[PDB]
Design a protein around this ligand. Structure first.
Ligand SMILES: [Zn+2]
Ligand SMILES: [Zn+2]
Ligand SMILES: [Zn+2]
Length: 87
DNA sequence: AGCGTGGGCGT
DNA sequence: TACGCCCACGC
């Protein structure tokens, strides 16, 4: 069940926990509570701030597993796309 | 390619 | 609630 309904104009989204609704509603309000301390860009979410910060350090914790391919990536989804490309 | 960001789901 | 994962879409 998903009783936490979004009531913004024309929106039908519904969620199972209050914070999931709150997270979603930032897409309507444009509120960005989290700020990068390196470049001062602001973000709606702390998880997306965290992956953003890897753009400044070069940290790429996700490594391709194909032999003789040295490629690494900042996020899991970039590695999925890459592994899909090797086939 | 690299990464913003919206949403599912977890602890 | 804080914090964060994964996946998917769109530049
Ligand atoms: Zn909404
Ligand atoms: Zn930054
Ligand atoms: Zn590879």
């Amino acid at each position: 069940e998903k009783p936490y309904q979004c009531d913004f104009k024309d929106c039908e989204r519904r969620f199972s926990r209050s914070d999931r609704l709150k997270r979603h509603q930032r897409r309507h309000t444009g509120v960005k509570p989290f700020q990068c301390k390196t470049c001062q860009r602001k973000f709606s979410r702390s998880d997306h701030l965290k992956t953003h910060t890897r753009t400044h350090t070069g940290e790429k914790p996700f490594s391709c597993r194909w032999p003789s391919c040295q490629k690494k990536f900042a996020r899991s989804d970039e590695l999925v796309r890459h592994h899909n490309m090797h086939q």
